[PDB]
Amino acid sequence: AALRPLVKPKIVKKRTKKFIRHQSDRYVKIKRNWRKPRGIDNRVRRRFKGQILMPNIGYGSNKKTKHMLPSGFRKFLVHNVKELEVLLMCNKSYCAEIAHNVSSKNRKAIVERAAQLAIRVTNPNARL
Amino acid sequence: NFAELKIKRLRKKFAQKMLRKARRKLIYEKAKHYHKEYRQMYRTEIRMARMARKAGNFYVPAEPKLAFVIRIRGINGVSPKVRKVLQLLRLRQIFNGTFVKLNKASINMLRIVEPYIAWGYPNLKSVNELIYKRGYGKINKKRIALTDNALIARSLGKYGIICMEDLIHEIYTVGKRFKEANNFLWPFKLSSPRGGMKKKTTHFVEGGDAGNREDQINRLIRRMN
Amino acid sequence: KGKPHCSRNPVLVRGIGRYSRSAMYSRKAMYKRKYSAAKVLATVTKPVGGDKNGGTRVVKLRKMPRYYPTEDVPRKLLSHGKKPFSQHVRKLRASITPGTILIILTGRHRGKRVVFLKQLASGLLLVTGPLVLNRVPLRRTHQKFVIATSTKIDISNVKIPKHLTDAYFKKKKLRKPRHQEGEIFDTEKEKYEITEQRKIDQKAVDSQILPKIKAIPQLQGYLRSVFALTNGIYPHKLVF
Amino acid sequence: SGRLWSKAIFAGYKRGLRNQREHTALLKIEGVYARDETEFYLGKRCAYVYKAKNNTVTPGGKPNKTRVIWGKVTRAHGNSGMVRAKFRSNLPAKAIGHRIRVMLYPSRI
Amino acid sequence: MACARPLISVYSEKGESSGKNVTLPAVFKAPIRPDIVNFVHTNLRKNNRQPYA
Amino acid sequence: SAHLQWMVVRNCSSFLIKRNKQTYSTEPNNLKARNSFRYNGLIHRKTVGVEPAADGKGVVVVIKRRSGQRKPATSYVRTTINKNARATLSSIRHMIRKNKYRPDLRMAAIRRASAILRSQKPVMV
Amino acid sequence: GVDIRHNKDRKVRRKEPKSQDIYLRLLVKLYRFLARRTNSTFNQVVLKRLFMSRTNRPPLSLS
RNA sequence: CCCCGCGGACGCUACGCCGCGACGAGUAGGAGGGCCGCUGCGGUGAGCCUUGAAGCCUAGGGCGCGGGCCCGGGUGGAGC
RNA sequence: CCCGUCGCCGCGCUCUCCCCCCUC
Ligand SMILES: [K+]
Ligand SMILES: [K+]
Ligand SMILES: [K+]
Ligand SMILES: [K+]
Ligand SMILES: [K+]
Ligand SMILES: [K+]
Ligand SMILES: [Mg+2]
Ligand SMILES: [Mg+2]
Ligand SMILES: [Mg+2]
Ligand SMILES: [Mg+2]
Ligand SMILES: [Mg+2]
Ligand SMILES: [Mg+2]
Ligand SMILES: [Mg+2]
Ligand SMILES: [Mg+2]
Ligand SMILES: [Mg+2]
């Protein structure tokens, strides 16, 4: 059915959960966006056991499967048909997706053209 | 000229083939010679002590000239003088072993780091299993596994050492080029002793694991690599 | 070309021959067997036919591709091992010998006691619990999912038919040819039919194994019961 | 027509006093109270069979409420017949003190 | 290349070559050097600015 | 010079697209449409480009001639190939290999021609 | 844990010109190839001088 | 002196790609990178947009170690 | 030129001729 990627390696994620900010659970004013704790007595910064984990480079994904979608493709944002033909020779490794601001009439032509060029669209049925 | 160049390439390949074939035969025979030498020394020590007992006298064997030193303590809270000597012994990590040629200068260094190391006199089997299983060469400042004889010969051939057997012979029977052969070896990265340690904080003669255990270092080596 | 000889170097341990290089040089008489010194037409011409259409046409076999993908995959490195399954060596436990009573551990014949006949070319065991005794036909089974009991019957000088191979016992299927879109069920044939050949073969093996089972007392009753674990006994304490 | 599996108890996870390694579980097999008797069970398939609310497909049967987390015995734990087991998914903590079946499937006898 | 100065046709208002030629001025063979162009452009666009406070 | 012009437009170009950790170049004669010195379709004395025909069938093979490098109006020679896929690929192979006209672009042009022709044949139901 | 010091691990040296001069970068490319693919130590010295700053490339008078 | 085959993957944004080895605690502090983010200006995208911009909401799908980002649905009504 | 069953290493057979033991 769907267009298949050139290769589909097993994607290994070291961590599947978000790094939430320290004490973002206790306050609405503090959002889940990560911020490095810099307090003198902060137990999260000191890395005490059972505390909120800190992001570091060891969690980095394998370079072979980085930015890979679950379908084995990587995404390139497109805004018109002209930007879609840059993926003609990258058909089996990169998939197009249409930007959110593109009109319903115009993204119909993009989906139609991408079907012709065998480019996979992540959101082919997006205003209809 | 196509035929002439093809023949020229075949001549060179054959010559290279004969050169390995001669080199392989040399490696084979030198290992045979070392085997003859190894039992000669093993039988000689038995025969030497055996004839002293016939006369009612005592044969005192030569003091061992080779020691295997294993660091048994970590890197926390080490006094500067002990820290410096361990670096000079290339023991920068716990359970890092290395071969030390024994003399007055080296023994007094081993006494300084007495609480931090366990050492003794390795036998022939210990040297073989350390070199073969965990032998890594310091080649161009890199830790390279000794998977081919060419790695040994490229860096040590000028000293006459061209194979693992030559490297083992130089280490065991402390030869003229022991320093070069020993330093060529990356310090041995041994596992934790399977079956545990008696007590790392005290000397071997008092029930612990530190200090000089003469031939008992071989028992430690088997559990440790 | 000479007739191929045997190895002349008996193997005493895998990877090591009994005789040395010089010993084998003499056994091979290599001293006198010394030697000093000494395709596939891709194109075919064919008479095309027709006046002033040329004599022939140089037609090349294996034409060039008419489409190339946007990208390909590099070839693999060479592995020097990793043989296919049909060339693997087949290992059989020493406790399993022809005539041994086995206990099936999985499948619809769970816990039944069957007779072992032979190991097949794929390593699968061929078993028959005399179909009269416990309703187990001539069937394949895996040695890793059976228990080899110590009770054995002598099934030597019985003839297991030659065609009883892995291809004989391999499953067959119908769906789904001549049919792509599933709107009318192709669930027909699902009733697997016992081939009259299978009944003939079952009758042939049983006719000569059943008499030997009847020889020693109450073995048919043993084969007729199933194996079970009772709250008193434990498998590690059991002698099979 | 028979139990065909050994009764075992999920005693807990491999752990220190203050650290718990949930990827491996310690099983107590009935009748095995010494380390030298655990040899038979090494490599044996073990299953944690439970029931849930929604039906799930049953291999060779109609869908029912039975679910299973499969595993196998890896090695002996301690001197008193405990064994360590690895399951495809870490055993839920609600199963501590409940039934684990040891299959006898990968038979070496 | 640098010393070579080609001849360029002068095109007529109708768009075709008029037959007159001009040798390429040497300035067109000068070093092309965007880092200087970017630097000069960066500091000269600041010169028409109007103060705010 | 190609190397000098590359140092100018390697990161500053109107055809440059830098999105989603990827980089693409949209100049007319860029096979694979990637930002690279080898595949740039503007900086080289000789280039080859493969485009779909004006109608919906065939390909246009455009090469750059060697004479008028400063005269873009007559600098490109466009030929149209409207035959079967195997014969079309052979023509492109001969144009690049037999002429020794940028042999490093042989498979890129052949693969691009295959993609264009594959896109021109009608879709299925 | 290993007993080493990490304060001297990163050697401080020019691995490229900090200039964006495209002509200097072109002849750095030329002499990066020459230093690599020849045994001439002259090319190595010239290449590393090309990375150097202006204060490390003082003018040479005619005298 | 290739030719019954006229043919033969990928690559090399050289600020790129590839290989090997060792290493990885950190307050005060220093430095680097940021295709992290905000606003405005010069260029550029024959960019997007009343066939719906900004903003906002969302048990929706994902990406990144992370800063954050993209896409679906709703609301909104003129810009981005 | 249908997908390098390849390098190092360790071997076996043939381009020699006789026999011996099973098997067709
Ligand atoms: K850190
Ligand atoms: K039940
Ligand atoms: K310095
Ligand atoms: K803009
Ligand atoms: K990110
Ligand atoms: K909106
Ligand atoms: Mg994530
Ligand atoms: Mg919050
Ligand atoms: Mg504090
Ligand atoms: Mg301490
Ligand atoms: Mg133990
Ligand atoms: Mg102390
Ligand atoms: Mg470390
Ligand atoms: Mg530090
Ligand atoms: Mg750090």
mmCIF file of C-alpha atoms in Angstrom, chain G residues 9-63:
data_model
loop_
_atom_site.group_PDB
_atom_site.id
_atom_site.type_symbol
_atom_site.label_atom_id
_atom_site.label_comp_id
_atom_site.label_asym_id
_atom_site.label_seq_id
_atom_site.Cartn_x
_atom_site.Cartn_y
_atom_site.Cartn_z
ATOM 1 C CA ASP G 9 43.775 16.793 26.478
ATOM 2 C CA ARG G 10 42.715 19.431 23.932
ATOM 3 C CA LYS G 11 45.783 20.814 22.176
ATOM 4 C CA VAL G 12 45.306 24.487 21.294
ATOM 5 C CA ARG G 13 46.378 24.940 17.674
ATOM 6 C CA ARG G 14 45.014 26.334 14.420
ATOM 7 C CA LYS G 15 43.453 23.550 12.349
ATOM 8 C CA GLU G 16 42.231 26.032 9.706
ATOM 9 C CA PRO G 17 42.397 29.761 8.958
ATOM 10 C CA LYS G 18 39.996 31.846 10.993
ATOM 11 C CA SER G 19 39.836 34.101 7.925
ATOM 12 C CA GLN G 20 36.933 33.788 5.491
ATOM 13 C CA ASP G 21 39.138 34.819 2.549
ATOM 14 C CA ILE G 22 37.953 32.445 -0.168
ATOM 15 C CA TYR G 23 41.246 32.779 -2.055
ATOM 16 C CA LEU G 24 43.185 31.868 1.083
ATOM 17 C CA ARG G 25 40.789 28.961 1.625
ATOM 18 C CA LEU G 26 41.403 27.753 -1.936
ATOM 19 C CA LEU G 27 45.182 27.574 -1.540
ATOM 20 C CA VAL G 28 44.669 26.044 1.899
ATOM 21 C CA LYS G 29 42.792 23.294 0.049
ATOM 22 C CA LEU G 30 45.686 22.996 -2.402
ATOM 23 C CA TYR G 31 48.326 22.744 0.328
ATOM 24 C CA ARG G 32 46.181 20.534 2.550
ATOM 25 C CA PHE G 33 46.301 18.009 -0.301
ATOM 26 C CA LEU G 34 50.027 18.547 -0.914
ATOM 27 C CA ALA G 35 50.926 18.078 2.756
ATOM 28 C CA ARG G 36 48.847 14.896 2.972
ATOM 29 C CA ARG G 37 49.856 13.260 -0.317
ATOM 30 C CA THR G 38 53.580 14.089 -0.228
ATOM 31 C CA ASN G 39 56.391 13.409 2.228
ATOM 32 C CA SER G 40 57.658 16.990 1.906
ATOM 33 C CA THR G 41 57.928 18.656 5.306
ATOM 34 C CA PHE G 42 58.073 21.975 3.442
ATOM 35 C CA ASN G 43 54.397 21.605 2.526
ATOM 36 C CA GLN G 44 53.539 20.868 6.163
ATOM 37 C CA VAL G 45 55.227 24.061 7.373
ATOM 38 C CA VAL G 46 53.655 26.166 4.615
ATOM 39 C CA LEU G 47 50.202 24.731 5.319
ATOM 40 C CA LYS G 48 50.353 25.506 9.036
ATOM 41 C CA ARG G 49 51.638 29.020 8.331
ATOM 42 C CA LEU G 50 48.589 29.568 6.114
ATOM 43 C CA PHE G 51 46.377 29.036 9.171
ATOM 44 C CA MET G 52 48.325 31.569 11.210
ATOM 45 C CA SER G 53 47.057 34.971 12.281
ATOM 46 C CA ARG G 54 48.406 38.233 10.892
ATOM 47 C CA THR G 55 50.536 38.861 13.982
ATOM 48 C CA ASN G 56 52.011 35.385 13.436
ATOM 49 C CA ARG G 57 52.683 36.276 9.774
ATOM 50 C CA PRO G 58 54.800 39.415 10.131
ATOM 51 C CA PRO G 59 55.753 41.319 6.975
ATOM 52 C CA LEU G 60 59.145 40.595 5.443
ATOM 53 C CA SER G 61 61.072 43.655 4.323
ATOM 54 C CA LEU G 62 62.933 43.646 1.025
ATOM 55 C CA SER G 63 66.238 44.262 2.820
#
